[PDB]
Each structure stands twice: as structure tokens, then as C-alpha cells.
Design a protein around this nucleic acid. Structure first.
Lengths: 99, 92, 87, 96, 108, 77, 96, 104, 91
DNA sequence: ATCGAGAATCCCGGTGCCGAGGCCGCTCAATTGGTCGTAGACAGCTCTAGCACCGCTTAAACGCACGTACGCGCTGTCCCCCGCGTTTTAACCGCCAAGGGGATTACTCCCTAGTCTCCAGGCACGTGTCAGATATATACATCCGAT
DNA sequence: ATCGGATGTATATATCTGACACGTGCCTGGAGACTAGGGAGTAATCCCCTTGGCGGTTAAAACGCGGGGGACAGCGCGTACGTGCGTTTAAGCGGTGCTAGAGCTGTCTACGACCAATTGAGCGGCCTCGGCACCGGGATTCTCGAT
């Protein structure tokens, strides 16, 4: 008997339902903290952090990226593409006044 | 050391709208965040209005005006009605 | 006097499947692989601007430690007001 | 640098940069472009045109106006060298 | 002296009209502050609070939860045109986003 | 009344906007958008006018309105 | 008889109206519109002439930038022709 | 004497101080605050006028006009960053066509 | 009567380009720019004051407000200029 | 075309916990209740800028024709993305130890506000010219077939 | 492809007018020279919360292997939009004239600030318990590859 397999993109729809249902953060905690610390250490030495400050940054960044990807989604859809491409982000950010 | 918050007034309002219902501390922190922001928005525009009209005083007129600028229509009208009613009651 | 190991290249720790989960919450069905590095760049810039101003509030406070309020102020002036950490 | 001064530099002969790129280089360099050899200071082209020798370049040769390869533009857009010597460095006019 | 009575109680409000007046003075917004202002402001804030918490409490009830959580707030906010317009540039910690998929992406 | 925003004016606007080619459906849509944009500004402007107890709108009312609506215009302060 | 090709004069028009700064809508009907809009927020209003001018500058500016976004939307859609969906996309991305 | 003269500036330091006080920004305004602020404003003024003057010279005009300001402000990245949400009366836009729209 | 920055702007114009004039509409726009930037700086300086419970806006607030508002090279140059002007005013 | 595996999802029920709700001391922040100076509400006057309406010109908008090139429905084919199995690998969690710096308190004084007297920087408003708008004729730039 | 028709564009010369560049009269707001009350600077002290690191588990990430459906190059063909001529119309302009109301001046007094006595309100700490989470098993949904 052939093993079961979902059709391509069917699980991606299930994944959309999943991560749209949950509130939970999506990035690996400590790596995100390491990145934030790395970036900060480029502005001034030995900078210390409240735990809360890190969590708030991850919330802010994830939310920003998510809304940005929604615009990106529309940009591909308007281009009749099912699939997102860097140009979608660029276009959206340009319309947004980030560029 | 001593802090302050809106939280009890929010909780009383909560009991009034939904007697049976509670709220998380993080959600209450969000409610405080909301009260702070909207307060600050109103107060800034009230200041600007007073400044543009050379008035030393921020008054009921400023709050009413600031609300009429800041809020979408029906939300603003309910808010205007409430604030007016509270002022007339307070005056009595 | 006891520091952690120095930080380099942690932008790669922002994983492909994490970026995908973010895009999935953003309702994206199908993803070109070119997105990952571009996203990393955008995120890196986005972070940097907030962090610099946060550090600027920290410096004005004469602090060595960044607070959540520092983050909040940075975000608010950068037009991305976050509820959940005020006071 | 601004090594040119309103020099009405003519452009001809299948240039690999577009006319508006070449104009931007010339005019960043303090110049001006032209289509008219009669009021041009100089002209720039692909070497292929000094092989083709179209009436347009022939008018420039009959004006004895010095002419140079397109990488002249790259060089002046990159270096402060005396244009007199850059004529030699990029020369397509044996004339002048 | 008479028995002490709150400006909030005279206003018929839960929000702290007295604290509001204090904050208005110390907030440097103007040289002077007319007594109707803190009342009107308090009433506005308290109304907006109620308007939020009504819909958030409904969202919680719909979710079979008896305690309000950040998800409910965000949901209620995006599900009203007026709140969403009031809060459009605002982000909510642990709010998530509206469950929403563009029809072109669905199976045939 | 809004139809007084002429087709060729909309074209000239699109031309300053670098647009090459134009669906006719644009013109009515543009009029709709313009009307909304005007309305939001004007409402706040009139609100400043009324707050000022004026019957006459000032350019400053427009300035303050545009500034709070995030579109600060230099040249009329 | 003579003709230009389609779009050629349109590119000439872009050059015209991008080189120029003149207001593009007719003054009188723009004012007429503003007044009837205002009548719904309050009766019996009046205006500084400068406020009308300031409004027109603002509106034309808002429209121009929005049209550039619209142009970019069509371009991203491989069209050279703008369509209402371009505006809608831009306005949605702008958060209007 | 004048406060601006001790500062070596054209901007009116006294008017800056008085503005700061009546602008309600604080209970108090330390003496160097208006001096620093004046210098910032004056510097930015100079940076703008410089570039607008260059633009006017390129336009072969002896007088600065709104076009020149807009042109300068959109040609410099840092000015354009500082002024992105600003609009300028009689500025127009940068002459700009997307390459896709051109012939061939 | 009616205040403006205009004469100071005019002296700056004379400094950078002696032979160059300005239109009334442009000078109006200059006043708009000055007003805007003054308000931005002062508002952030006020916020810094609140955020640190300080009664007083000082040079340090202005320097910081500049560091928040201006992009890089403008901020550096403005900081240098303000520091210089303060130094000269102090002497 | 509609019908079975079977994969994922959502639904009852026992545990149990730990965050939310609650109650009590109790500090300071609200209220109470008195001044008082000046903000500002209100009357008055005036002149200016906004509003109305008129006739004439000509720039503009419009209305109609037409063709080309643009949009766009359809097809092929190539691969780059999704899905799924194995691997590894590093994120995660607990708990531990050190000590930097955030937080608070107490002191002392430098300095920003405030006050009066003085006066020149800066403002209002006359006025002369040269900057530049407006042709206008002219010499370039560049588009478009037709070859 | 070049080559010349055309027409559109940018460039000399005049000119003329009127905006801005500058001068004078003058007043008010800056500023010089005081004073002091308290903001905030600096020191000291506490302890808490941040930072580091180690060992163990296992969730997630990485990694590799199909394969199909989405991206997109080509393309046939239908119209709608660009260019251009002729029509008409209403924007514009410069005029006139009106008077509403915006702006300045002036009076008078309502009420927000300042101080000071009082106390209960809201905050901080310490209970205690039920809404929620959590498996865990069980019922329902929905998908796919058959048909």
C-alpha cells in the first residue's frame, strides 16, 4: 500500500490555521536575545537588559514581521502569484514609507 | 517605595459590564497602557488647542474638542455625551 | 569580571521555519527561498533603529541597563506603540 | 570632480551606457551633452563607430574634434586626470 | 468640616477625577486647568474602557473563558471599525492576529 | 457637483505621478478617494474653526488638521 | 498626415507636469466642492482664500504620491496601465 | 550685549528661551538649552539654503523658490528622511520615469 | 506684532550665498521648517524630562533629542555646532 | 462521479496548581475650605477680506473617430517549492554564584526663575530697481516612418 | 539601418514691471544685574536582578529526496485607451460693491492656584482557592486516492 501524503499546500493551509489560532511567539527565545545583544553591542559596550525588555522586543519584531508579510501576501496575490518574492516586501515597504 | 495604576477603576468597570468576568494581570497592564495613551493624546491636543487660542487654561471645551478630533464619530458622540452628563451631574 | 562568549552572526539563528511560521501567521501560503536573507536584513535594520534610540534613552538616564520602558519609548517615537509593558 | 564646464559633449555610435546615463556622467563632471558637433567640445563613442565612420563621426573628424572610447567616461567619472592625457588614454581620434 | 466626598462620586464615575486633575497639573499641558476638564476626561476614559471591556468580555465568553486575556482585547479591537481606527498603529502583546485567509489560496 | 474634477485634470495629476496608461474606472474611484481625503481634513479644520468660535476657516485650521492627520504642509504657517 | 505613436505624447506629458509646479485642478470648481463638503460638518461656513489654495496643494500632492504607488502596483503586476485595484492595494498597504 | 553674539549665531537666543518657557515644555530651562537649540536650527537652515542655492544656480536663478527647496530636500537622503511626511507648497516632484515605461 | 524667523534666515542666506536671494513663499516654507523642528526637539526634550522626573530641560536634553530625531551625519554636525555654541557662550 | 482509510481536530473528565481575586494596615494624596489676581468672558467698534455678481475671452474640457498595442486566457515545461523521514543539535530548563548597577536615601549648593530698570534688535512700512516673466524668433533635439 | 520631414523643445534679445532687497522710526522684549529656594548633582549604601555556566532532555532545525503545480515565456486576439480634430462652455479675470465678522481695544469678576488641616484610598503584602491548563482518551471532522 502507498503511504499517505497530503497534497502540496494543503498542510500549509492547516499551518496557517494553526499559527493564526495561537498567540504564542514563533522565534527561538535565546537566539533572538543573542541577536538583540549583538546589535546593541554595536552601539555601546556591555549593555545590560531587563528580561521584559527582550520579550517586548520579540513581541514587537514578530508583530512587525507578520503585518509586513500580510502586505507581502497581497503583493504576490496582486501579481497573480501564489508565492511570495523579495520584490513583494520591497514594494510594500516602499508604499509604507520605510523606503 | 510606592507605585500607582488605573487597575481598580478598570476592574470596577469590568464588574459593571460583566459581573461574572475576570481579567489577567497582563491584560490589565494592556488596559493601563491604553488609558495612559488615550489620556496623553487628549491632553496634547487640549494643550495645542489652548496654545493656538492663547488660553492659559485647559477646560471642558478643550476635552470636548480634543475628543471630537481624536475619535471616530459614534464612539466620539457617546464619549461627548458621557463627559457632558458627568460635568452637569458634577456641577449639581 | 566574568563575561559570556562574544556575539557574532546571530542573525542566522533566526531560523527558516521560524520565518515560515511568521509568514504563516501572516497568511502566506507559498514562500520563495530568497525571502529568508531579505527578511533577516529587514529585521536587522528594524531592530537597530529601535535599539539605538532605546540605548539613547538608557544613556540619557545615565543607565548601563536597558529597560522595557526604553524599548517602549523607542517604539512609540518610531510610530509602533506596543501595549503590554507600560509601567 | 567637475573637470568639464558646459562642454556640449556629443554622444554617438552604439554607446553601451544609455544616453541619459552618459549625460548624467558628463553633467556630474560639470559638462553638458549635445547632438550637434558644430557646438560640441568633444565626442564619446564605442570604437565600432570609428570603424563604421558614419557621416555623424565624419563631421566630427572634419571638425578635427578629439574623440574617445566610452571607458573615458568611466575614467573621468573615477579619476581627476588631465583630459588632454585621457584623450590619449582613450583615443579614437587620430585627428586633432 | 463637612464629611469628605470625592469629585469622582459627584461626577458618578469610577475613574479617579482627583488623580486626573493632579496628572493634568504636573503634566505641563497648560498654565491652568478648569475643574470640568478632569471630570470630562475621566468620563471619556471610563466610557472607552467600558466599550472595550464589553466587547472583550463578549470575546472571552465566546471563547468559553471567564477571564479576559490579551487575545480578547486584540480581537475586540480589530472587530470594531472605530476601535481599530483608533488603535490602528497600536500593537498588542500576545494579541495575535485575525484568523483570515485570501480566497485565491484555498483549494478548488 | 464632484464631477467638476475633470478627466484631463486627473490625467495631469497621474502624469505628475509618472503614470503612462490609464483605465477609465480610475476617474470615479479617484473622485471617491479625493472626496474622503477632503472630508477627513475638512471635518477637523471646521472643528478648529468652531473651537475658535469663528465662522471663517483659516489656513491655520488646515495646517493643524493636516499635521494631526500626518501630512504637514509647509508654505501656509 | 503626421502622427506620434501611442504613449509618446504621454511621456512628453510626464516630462511637462514633472518639470512644472502649477496646480492642476480648476480653482473655482475645487472651491465649490470644498464648500458643499463643509456644509455637512456645519452650516453657513466661510473660508480664507489661502485655506482653499492650501487644500488644493495638499490634495494634489496626496493624489500624486498615491498615483506613484499606484504606478508601482501596476508595474509589479507587469501592467503599464493603472486599474482601481492598484489604488485599493496602495491605500490598504497605507492603512487607509 | 546679546546672547546670540556670545553664542556666535544669527538665530535669536532670547526669543528661543522665551519660546521654550511659554511653550510649556517643562517647569525649567537651563541657560545652554536655547543656545544649543538655536545652533541646531541655524545649522539645518544653512545646510538647506546651501543646497537650494546650488539648485537655484543650476536653474540660473538668483532667488530661491519653493521648487529649489523641494528639489534639494528630495535629492539629499538625510533631508528626505527628516522631511518624508512633509509636503511643500509649489514644490512639485523629482523628474522621474520608471525604465519599464520607456520605448524599446 | 507678528513674529517670524525671517531676518535670521536671511542672514544665513547671506552667509552661505552672498549673491543669492529668496522668494516670499520660500521664506514662508523656511519658517514652517523652523517651527516644525523646534516643536519636534522641544516635545522630545519635554518627554525626556518627564521620563526622568526632571524639572529642567538643558543642553543634555537638546543633545539627546537631536540624537533621537536627526539622521546620522546631520546629528553629528548639529551636536558639534551646539557643543561649540555652548562652549563659546560659556566663555 | 461518490466512497473508505486515516490523519488531524475537537470534545468530556480527573488533577492540581498558582495567578487572580480578595482583605487588611495604613501614607500621602485627595478633599476640604479659605484667598485673589488675572484669564477670560463679554461689549463695543471698524475696516478688511470675504462674499456676491457682472461681461468677455479664450483655455480648457469635452465629444467623436480609430488603430495599435496593450491586457489577458490559454499552454507548455521546467524546478523550486512542499511534504515527509532521519539525523543532530542546540534550544531549552533548573539551579546554582557572583557581583554590577539599579534603586534609594541624605546633603549641599549652583543656578534658573523671578524683578526691575534700559534701550537696540527687530519689527513695520516706504521705494527703487534688476530679477525674472513673457514673448518671439531662432537654432537645437528627437521621433517616425519609408527607405 | 539611415534620413529627412516636423515639430517640439531650449536659447538669444528685448522690456517692463513689480517683489524683494534695503533704509528709517521706533518700542518692547531681551538682557544686565541683581536675589534664593530648591533641582539636581554627588556619595554612600543595599540587595536584587542581571549575568554565566554547568548538566540533561528532547523539540526543533537541519538535512536529504522526490514530484507536481506554480512561475512564467510565448501568443493569439479583442477593445479601450492614446492622439488628434472640431465643438462648446465655463473657467477665468478684472472689475465692482457690499457687509459680516474677524480683529483690536477695553472692564470687570469667576475661579484655579496656593496654603494648610485632615483622613480614607489606594497601594503593598500575605492569604487561599477555581479557572485554567493537561493530559488522555474518546467522538467528530475532513482530506485524499481510490472509484
Amino acid at each position: 500500500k502507498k503511504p499517505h501524503r497530503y497534497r502540496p499546500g494543503t498542510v500549509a493551509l492547516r499551518e496557517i490555521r494553526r499559527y493564526q489560532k495561537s498567540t504564542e511567539l514563533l522565534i527561538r527565545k535565546l537566539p533572538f536575545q543573542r541577536l538583540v545583544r549583538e546589535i546593541a553591542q554595536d552601539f555601546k559596550t556591555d549593555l545590560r537588559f531587563q528580561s521584559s525588555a527582550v520579550m517586548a522586543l520579540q513581541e514587537a519584531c514578530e508583530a512587525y514581521l507578520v503585518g509586513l508579510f500580510e502586505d507581502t501576501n497581497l503583493c504576490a496575490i496582486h501579481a497573480k502569484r501564489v508565492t511570495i518574492m523579495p520584490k513583494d516586501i520591497q514594494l510594500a515597504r516602499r508604499i509604507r514609507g520605510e523606503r | 517605595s510606592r507605585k500607582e495604576s488605573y487597575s481598580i477603576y478598570v476592574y470596577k468597570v469590568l464588574k459593571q459590564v460583566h459581573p461574572d468576568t475576570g481579567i489577567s494581570s497582563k491584560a490589565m497592564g494592556i488596559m493601563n497602557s491604553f488609558v495612559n495613551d488615550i489620556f496623553e493624546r487628549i491632553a496634547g491636543e487640549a494643550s495645542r488647542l489652548a496654545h493656538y487660542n492663547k488660553r492659559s487654561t485647559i477646560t471642558s471645551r478643550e476635552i470636548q474638542t480634543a475628543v471630537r478630533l481624536l475619535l471616530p464619530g459614534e464612539l466620539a458622540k457617546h464619549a461627548v455625551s458621557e463627559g457632558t452628563k458627568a460635568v452637569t451631574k458634577y456641577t449639581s | 569580571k566574568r563575561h559570556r562568549k562574544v556575539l557574532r552572526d546571530n542573525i542566522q539563528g533566526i531560523t527558516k521555519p521560524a520565518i515560515r511560521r511568521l509568514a504563516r501567521r501572516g497568511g502566506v501560503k507559498r514562500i520563495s527561498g530568497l525571502i529568508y536573507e531579505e527578511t533577516r536584513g529587514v529585521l536587522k535594520v528594524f531592530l537597530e533603529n529601535v535599539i539605538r534610540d532605546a540605548v539613547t534613552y538608557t544613556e540619557h538616564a545615565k543607565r548601563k541597563t536597558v529597560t522595557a520602558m526604553d524599548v517602549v519609548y523607542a517604539l512609540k517615537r518610531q510610530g509602533r506603540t506596543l501595549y503590554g509593558f507600560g509601567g | 570632480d567637475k573637470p568639464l564646464s558646459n562642454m556640449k559633449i556629443l554622444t554617438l555610435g552604439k554607446l553601451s551606457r544609455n544616453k541619459d546615463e552618459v549625460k548624467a556622467m558628463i553633467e556630474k563632471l560639470g559638462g553638458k551633452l549635445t547632438g550637434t558637433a558644430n557646438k560640441a567640445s568633444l565626442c564619446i563613442s564605442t570604437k565600432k563607430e570609428v570603424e563604421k565612420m558614419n557621416k555623424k563621426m565624419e563631421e566630427v573628424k572634419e571638425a578635427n574634434i578629439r574623440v574617445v572610447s566610452e571607458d573615458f567616461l568611466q575614467d573621468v567619472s573615477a579619476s581627476t586626470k588631465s583630459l588632454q592625457e585621457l584623450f590619449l588614454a582613450h583615443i579614437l581620434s587620430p585627428w586633432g | 468640616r463637612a464629611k469628605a466626598k470625592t469629585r469622582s462620586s459627584r461626577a458618578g464615575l469610577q475613574f479617579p477625577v482627583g488623580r486626573v486633575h493632579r496628572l493634568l497639573r504636573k503634566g505641563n499641558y497648560s498654565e491652568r486647568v478648569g475643574a470640568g476638564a478632569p471630570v470630562y476626561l475621566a468620563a471619556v476614559l471610563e466610557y472607552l474602557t467600558a466599550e472595550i471591556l464589553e466587547l472583550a468580555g463578549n470575546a472571552a465568553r465566546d471563547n468559553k473563558k471567564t477571564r479576559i486575556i490579551p487575545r480578547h482585547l486584540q480581537l475586540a479591537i480589530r472587530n470594531d471599525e472605530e476601535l481599530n481606527k483608533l488603535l490602528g498603529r497600536v500593537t498588542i502583546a500576545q494579541g495575535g492576529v485575525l484568523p483570515n485567509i485570501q480566497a485565491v489560496l484555498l483549494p478548488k
